[PDB]
Ligand binder design. Structure first.
Ligand SMILES: Nc1ncnc2c1ncn2[C@@H]1O[C@H](COP(=O)(O)OP(=O)(O)OP(=O)(O)O)[C@@H](O)[C@H]1O
Ligand SMILES: [Mg+2]
Ligand SMILES: [Zn+2]
Ligand SMILES: [Zn+2]
Length: 421
């Protein structure tokens, strides 16, 4: 019912190591449950809120081990670097690691340890020694970037068996009751605290447009012209359905001599740290990406997001656009789509085998098409999917305004009802 305010020493720790002056509410609710109440958590946090602080902060505060489990190996490398820049010792642990590195974890060097779901199953005795010798503040089972996953996730029911005293934070991307029930049974969570941040990003304007037949003609509205050169109005990410289309979009932007970078799924640590530096320093105006996570696209002042093609589904779409406007200033997210787009092609779906995943692909395909075809508020459609209920239109202060979405804006441009309270 009531959450106590963080004490002085807790706020000071958050300032020294994470560079924040105060907690956001759901962050504190999750942190306080884990740190002070030792309670299992299922935390529904939309992207951009600060998921990663909820499991990084407690172990740093008490100087103990925090165990983070995630299937995305490159993302965990990116976080370990970010933590090292913040003076926080962290490592990514696997069988490929030296026996020497395992020594430092036993001795307690690393506040935050990253492992894959597979590694965690085969080294349970190692964890209990870490519990006995050093002490574990929490176990973070992310699975909020889960795509096409398995046995790996059902082998984690042993954590509460081997480590009954260690709280578990389960981060998730939807408020779905079905997902929450599955997570609770899989992890054997005990009366878990449930939180939800909500999913709105009021500073993102949502537009959908049809393609015109040529890449340059589609991108022309998004370019401004200095008397010498063409440029985007601001830092821009362009999401493509494939690396072939990324190279096509890249080729057209060279014709205008635009600072561009590509961001794909097999890039090395150096390549990802190079894109990050160039993107944040504005040395490249635009990133054309085939993935929706990692260092390279982690920038605070991305002004424009363009989907050059229909997105695969709402979950990917929400994550992709959530990289924009992280500074809280105005941003725009445009989809450029055609009915023949790859992520809207049903006929390709026949060739792949698995049934009821083709049906899931079918349902996501049809849901995505309904969104792109909608004449109603696009913000309402997205929030209703992630809240798993019917979000009432114009309850939030942004919906129904010229800043909300192209359908609201055009309706207000044609004698719409600017709603007074
Ligand atoms: N309490 C806070 N006060 C101010 N800024 C914060 C706070 N917590 C987090 N942030 C900042 O908000 C931004 C979003 O946080 P973060 O980078 O952890 O995203 P995320 O939700 O974990 O994303 P993803 O889904 O990609 O993992 C970052 O710039 C982070 O430093
Ligand atoms: Mg994160
Ligand atoms: Zn309490
Ligand atoms: Zn709207």
């Amino acid at each position: 019912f009531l959450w106590p305010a963080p004490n002085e020493e807790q706020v000071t720790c958050l300032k020294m190591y994470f560079g924040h002056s105060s907690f956001k509410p759901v962050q504190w609710k999750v942190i306080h449950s884990v740190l002070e109440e030792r309670r299992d958590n299922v935390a529904v946090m939309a992207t951009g809120y600060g998921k990663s602080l909820c499991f990084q902060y407690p172990p740093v505060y008490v100087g103990k081990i925090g165990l983070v489990i995630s299937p995305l190996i490159s993302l965990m490398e990116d976080q370990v670097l970010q933590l090292k820049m913040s003076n926080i010792p962290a490592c990514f642990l696997g069988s490929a690691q030296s026996e020497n590195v395992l020594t430092d974890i036993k001795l307690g060097k690393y506040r935050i340890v990253y492992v894959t779901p597979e590694y965690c199953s085969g080294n349970m005795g190692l964890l209990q020694q870490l519990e006995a010798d050093i002490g574990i503040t929490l176990i973070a089972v992310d699975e909020a970037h889960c795509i096409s996953e398995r046995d790996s996730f059902r082998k984690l029911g042993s954590l509460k068996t081997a480590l009954p005293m260690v709280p578990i934070v389960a981060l998730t991307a939807t408020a779905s009751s079905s997902i929450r029930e599955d997570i609770v049974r899989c992890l054997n969570l005990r009366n878990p605290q449930i939180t939800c941040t909500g999913f709105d990003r009021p500073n993102l304007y949502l537009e959908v447009r049809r393609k015109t037949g040529n890449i340059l003609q589609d991108l022309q509205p998004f370019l401004v012209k200095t008397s010498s050169h063409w440029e985007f109005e601001g830092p821009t990410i362009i999401y493509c359905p494939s690396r072939k289309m990324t190279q096509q979009v890249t080729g057209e932007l060279r014709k205008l001599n635009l600072s561009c970078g590509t961001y794909h799924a097999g890039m090395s640590f150096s390549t990802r740290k190079d894109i990050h530096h160039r993107f944040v320093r504005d040395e490249i105006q635009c990133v054309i990406a085939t993935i929706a996570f990692g260092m390279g696209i982690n920038k605070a002042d991305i002004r424009q997001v363009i989907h050059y093609g229909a997105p695969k589904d709402m979950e990917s779409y929400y994550q992709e656009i959530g990289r924009a406007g992280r500074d809280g200033l105005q941003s725009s997210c445009h989809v450029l789509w055609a009915p023949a787009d790859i992520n809207l092609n049903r006929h390709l779906l026949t060739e792949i085998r698995n049934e009821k995943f083709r049906l899931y692909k079918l349902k996501m395909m049809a849901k995505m098409e309904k969104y792109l075809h909608s004449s109603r508020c696009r913000r309402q459609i997205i929030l209703s999917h992630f809240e798993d209920k019917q979000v009432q239109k114009a309850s939030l202060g942004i919906m129904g305004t010229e800043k909300c979405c192209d359908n609201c804006r055009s309706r207000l441009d044609h004698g719409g009802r600017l709603e007074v309270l």
